[PDB]
Amino acid sequence: QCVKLNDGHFMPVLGFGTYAPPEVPRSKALEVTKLAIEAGFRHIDSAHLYNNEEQVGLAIRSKIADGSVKREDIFYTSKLWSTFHRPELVRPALENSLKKAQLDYVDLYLIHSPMSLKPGEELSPTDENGKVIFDIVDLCTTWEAMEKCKDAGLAKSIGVSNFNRRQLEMILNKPGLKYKPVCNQVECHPYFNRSKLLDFCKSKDIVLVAYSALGSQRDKRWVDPNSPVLLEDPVLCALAKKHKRTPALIALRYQLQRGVVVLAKSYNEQRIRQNVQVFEFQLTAEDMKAIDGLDRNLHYFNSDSFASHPNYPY
Amino acid sequence: QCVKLNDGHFMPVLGFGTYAPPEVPRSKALEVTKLAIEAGFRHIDSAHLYNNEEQVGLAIRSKIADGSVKREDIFYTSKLWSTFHRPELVRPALENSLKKAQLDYVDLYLIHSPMSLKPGEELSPTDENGKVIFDIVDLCTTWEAMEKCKDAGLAKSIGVSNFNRRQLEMILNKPGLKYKPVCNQVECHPYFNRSKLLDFCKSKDIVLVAYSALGSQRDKRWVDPNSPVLLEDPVLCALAKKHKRTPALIALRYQLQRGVVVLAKSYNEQRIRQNVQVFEFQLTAEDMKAIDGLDRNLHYFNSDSFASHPNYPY
Numbered sequence: 074q075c076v077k078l079n080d081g082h083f084m085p086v087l088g089f090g091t092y093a094p095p096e097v098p099r100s101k102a103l104e105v106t107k108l109a110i111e112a113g114f115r116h117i118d119s120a121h122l123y124n125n126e127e128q129v130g131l132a133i134r135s136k137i138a139d140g141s142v143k144r145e146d147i148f149y150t151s152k153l154w155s156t157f158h159r160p161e162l163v164r165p166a167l168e169n170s171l172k173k174a175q176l177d178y179v180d181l182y183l184i185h186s187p188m189s190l191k192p193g194e195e196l197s198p199t200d201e202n203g204k205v206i207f208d209i210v211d212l213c214t215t216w217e218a219m220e221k222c223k224d225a226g227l228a229k230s231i232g233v234s235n236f237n238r239r240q241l242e243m244i245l246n247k248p249g250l251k252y253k254p255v256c257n258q259v260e261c262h263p264y265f266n267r268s269k270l271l272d273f274c275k276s277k278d279i280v281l282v283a284y285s286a287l288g289s290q291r292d293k294r295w296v297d298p299n300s301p302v303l304l305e306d307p308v309l310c311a312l313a314k315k316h317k318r319t320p321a322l323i324a325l326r327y328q329l330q331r332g333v334v335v336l337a338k339s340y341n342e343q344r345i346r347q348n349v350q351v352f353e354f355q356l357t358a359e360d361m362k363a364i365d366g367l368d369r370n371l372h373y374f375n376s377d378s379f380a381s382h383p384n385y386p387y
Numbered sequence: 388q389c390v391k392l393n394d395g396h397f398m399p400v401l402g403f404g405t406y407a408p409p410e411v412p413r414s415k416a417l418e419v420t421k422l423a424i425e426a427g428f429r430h431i432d433s434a435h436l437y438n439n440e441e442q443v444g445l446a447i448r449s450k451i452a453d454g455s456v457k458r459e460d461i462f463y464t465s466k467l468w469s470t471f472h473r474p475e476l477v478r479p480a481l482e483n484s485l486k487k488a489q490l491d492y493v494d495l496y497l498i499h500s501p502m503s504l505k506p507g508e509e510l511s512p513t514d515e516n517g518k519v520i521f522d523i524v525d526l527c528t529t530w531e532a533m534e535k536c537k538d539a540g541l542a543k544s545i546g547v548s549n550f551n552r553r554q555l556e557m558i559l560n561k562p563g564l565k566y567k568p569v570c571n572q573v574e575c576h577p578y579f580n581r582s583k584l585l586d587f588c589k590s591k592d593i594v595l596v597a598y599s600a601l602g603s604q605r606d607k608r609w610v611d612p613n614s615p616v617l618l619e620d621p622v623l624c625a626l627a628k629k630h631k632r633t634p635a636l637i638a639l640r641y642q643l644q645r646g647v648v649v650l651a652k653s654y655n656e657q658r659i660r661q662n663v664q665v666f667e668f669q670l671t672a673e674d675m676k677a678i679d680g681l682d683r684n685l686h687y688f689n690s691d692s693f694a695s696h697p698n699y700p701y
C-alpha cells in the first residue's frame with residue numbers, strides 16, 4: 074500500500090532502513106537489501122552518509138535483472154549531505170549518488186539535515202580540537218537547487234529531513250517557491266511521537282516519515298546507554314502477547330494507523346521477513362491510546378554536541 | 388531550613404501557596420494562612436492576580452500581633468501583574484499591594500509573567516472579539532523599575548516568574564545591571580521536572596522555585612481533565628509505601644533534594660499540617676532516579692491561547 078504525495082507521486086508506507094555501523098562489512102548491505110525486496114519491501118532508504126549506495130544500488134539492479142521487480146516498482150531514497158548545501162554543489166552531489174548506485178534517477182532526494190557544514194573533502198570537517206566546523210547557508214537557496222534537480226528528472230520528488238516546524242515554514246514561505254517538500258523524515262517512536270509536528274505536517278500536506286521507529290540501534294557514539302530500551306517497554310510487550318505479534322510489530326503498526334510512513338532497519342534475515350507482517354493485523358483504538366500515553370519527548374540522538382549551530386533542530 | 392539568595396537574603400525552602408478559585412470565599416484565605424503559619428510554614432506566596440492580598444496580609448499581621456512570630460520570621464511574596472509592566476506603573480503597583488496587605492515591605496517581588504498586557508482596569512483586557520490585548524514592553528526597563536523598588540526598601544529581594552532561558556539571559560546581560568533576579572518561579576513537577584532550566588539557573592546562582600509541584604488544582608478553565616493525575620502516579624504511590632508517607636510528600640521531598648524551593652497549596656487543615664512532614668525523611672539515590680524517569684514534558688496549564696505573544700515562554 075502507498076500514500077499519494079503532494080506532487081502526484083506515490084510512496085510505499087513501509088520502508089527498509091539501510092544504515093549499518095562501520096563494524097558491519099559492506100557486503101551485508103547487498104545481501105540484506107536483496108532479502109528486503111524478496112520479503113516484500115518496495116521503499117528503500119539510503120544516503121551519501123551511509124557509505125553503502127554502491128551495494129544498495131547493486132541489490133536493486135539485481136532484483137530488476139533477475140525479473141522479481143521493475144524499476145517503477147521500487148521507491149529509492151537518497152540524501153544530500155550537509156557539506157553540499159551551497160547550491161552549486163547540490164546537483165553534482167546527486168549525480169555522484171546516481172553514479173555510485175548505478176541508477177538513472179532517485180525517487181526521493183532529501184536535505185539530510187538543516188545544519189550546514191563547511192564544504193570540503195571531509196564528511197565531518199573538524200578543527201584542531203575535534204570541533205565540527207559550521208557553514209552559513211540560506212537553506213532556501215539549497216531548496217532552489219533541489220527544485221532544479223526535480224525539473225532535470227534526476228529526482229522524482231524532493232523533501233527534507235530533521236527539520237522542525239520553524240525550519241519547515243522557512244521553506245513554505247520562500248518567495249517564488251515552486252515545489253513544497255513532499256515529506257519531513259524525523260525521529261519518531263512511542264517515546265517521542267511528534268504529535269504536534271505531525272498535525273502541522275498534515276495541515277500542510279507533508280508526509281511525516283519516522284526513523285528510529287524501533288528505538289534506534291543504540292550506537293554508543295550517539296545514544297546514551299542508560300536510556301530505556303523501547304522494545305522492552307512493558308506496554309509494548311503486553312500488546313505483543315495480546316495480538317500474538319512482537320513489540321517491534323506493535324511499534325510499526327502504531328505509526329501506520331496514525332498516518333506516519335515508517336522505516337525499519339534490520340540486517341537479520343528472520344526479522345526482515347517478520348517486519349512485513351505489519352500489514353497483517355490491526356490495533357484497536359484503546360490499544361492506540363495506551364501507546365499514545367508512553368510519550369516522553371525522549372530523543373535517542375545525543376545531538377547536544379551540536380546545539381551551537383544556528384540551525385540546531387531541537 | 389533556608390537557602391541563601393544571591394543578594395544575601397534567605398528564603399525558606401518550603402512555601403505555602405495561597406491561590407484559590409473565586410468559588411472559595413475570601414474568608415478562607417485568612418483562616419488557612421493562619422493555619423499554615425501555626426503548622427510551621429514561614430514562606431507565603433501571593434500575588435495581585437489572586438484577589439486575596441488583604442486576607443493573607445491580615446493573617447500574617449494576626450500571627451505577629453498574637454505573639455506567635457515576628458515579622459522577620461515570615462517571608463512574604465507578591466508579584467507584579469502583566470498590565471503594570473510599563474516602568475512608571477511598577478512602584479505604584481507595589482505600593483498598592485503593600486497597602487492592601489498592610490505590610491511595610493515584601494520579602495520578594497516578582498514579575499509574574501513575561502507576557503505584557505494592555506494597561507487598564509481588567510486583569511485581562513479583551514477587545515470586541517474576545518482576544519486579549521497584548522502590550523509591547525522592553526522587559527529590561529521593567530527590571531530597572533524593580534531594582535528601584537529594592538533600593539527604596541519596599542522589596543527586600545526581586546525576581547521573575549515564568550521566564551525561559553533566553554528571557555533570563557536578556558536580563559543577566561543587560562548593561563548596567565544592578566541586581567540579578569534571585570529566583571525564577573516556574574511550573575515544576577515529576578512530569579515536567581525542568582532539569583535543563585534547573586542546571587542553567589544553578590550555573591547563574593538563581594534559585595528555581597517550583598509551582599504546581601503537586602500537579603496543579605486541575606481547574607477545568609486551565610487544565611485538560613484528561614491529563615494524568617500526578618498524585619495517583621503508581622511510582623509515587625510505591626515510594627509512599629516504602630517511606631510510610633504519602634505521594635504528595637514524595638513529590639515535595641523530590642524537589643528539596645535537587646536544590647529546588649517548593650510551594651504547596653492546601654486549604655485543608657490536615658493536609659496543611661502533613662506537608663511540613665517533608666523535613667522528617669529522605670529519598671534514596673535510587674528513589675530519586677525512579678522519579679527522574681517520570682519526566683514527560685507535560686505542563687498542565689493550557690497556555691496555547693497565548694502562543695502568539697512575542698514573549699510566550701514555551
Ligand SMILES: NC(=O)c1ccc[n+]([C@@H]2O[C@H](COP(=O)([O-])OP(=O)(O)OC[C@H]3O[C@@H](n4cnc5c(N)ncnc54)[C@H](OP(=O)(O)O)[C@@H]3O)[C@@H](O)[C@H]2O)c1
Pocket residue numbers: 089090091092093118119185234235258259283284285286287288289290304319321322336337338339340341344345347348
Ligand atoms: N534522516 C536521518 O537523519 C536518519 C537518522 C537515523 C536513521 N535514519 C534511517 O532510518 C533507518 C532505521 O532507523 P534506525 O537505524 O534508527 O533503526 P530502527 O529502525 O529504529 O530499528 C533499530 C533496531 O531494531 C532491530 N530490529 C529490527 N526489526 C526487529 C524486530 N522485528 N524485532 C526486534 N528487533 C528488531 C534491528 O536490529 P537487527 O538489525 O539485529 O535486526 C535494528 O538495529 C536507518 O537505517 C536509516 O535508513 C535516518
Ligand SMILES: NC(=O)c1ccc[n+]([C@@H]2O[C@H](COP(=O)([O-])OP(=O)(O)OC[C@H]3O[C@@H](n4cnc5c(N)ncnc54)[C@H](OP(=O)(O)O)[C@@H]3O)[C@@H](O)[C@H]2O)c1
Pocket residue numbers: 403404405406407432433499548549572573597598599600601602603604618633635636650651652653654655658659661662
Ligand atoms: N507564578 C505562577 O504563575 C503560578 C502558577 C500557579 C501556581 N502558583 C503558586 O504556586 C501555588 C501552588 O501551586 P498550585 O496552586 O498549582 O497547587 P499545588 O501546590 O500543585 O497543589 C495542588 C493540590 O494539591 C492538594 N494537596 C495539597 N497537599 C496535599 C496532600 N498532602 N495530599 C494530597 N493532596 C494535597 C491541594 O488540594 P486541597 O486544597 O484540597 O488540599 C491542591 O489543590 C499556588 O497556590 C500559587 O501560589 C504560581
Ligand SMILES: COc1ccc(Cn2nnc(O)c2C(=O)Nc2cccc(C(F)(F)F)c2)cc1
Pocket residue numbers: 092120122185186187235260285289290295372373374376386
Ligand atoms: C536516534 O537518532 C539517530 C540519529 C542518527 C543516527 C545515525 N544515522 N543513521 N542514519 C542517519 O541518516 C543517521 C544520521 O546521522 N542522521 C543525522 C545526521 C546529521 C544530523 C542529524 C540531526 F539533525 F538529527 F542532528 C541527524 C542514528 C540514530
Ligand SMILES: COc1ccc(Cn2nnc(O)c2C(=O)Nc2cccc(C(F)(F)F)c2)cc1
Pocket residue numbers: 406434436499500501549574599603604609686687688690700
Ligand atoms: C499548572 O499551570 C498553572 C498555571 C497557572 C494557574 C493559575 N494561577 N495560579 N497562580 C498563578 O500565579 C496562576 C497564573 O495564572 N499564572 C500565570 C499567569 C499568566 C501567565 C502564566 C504563564 F506564563 F505560565 F503562561 C502564568 C494554574 C495552573
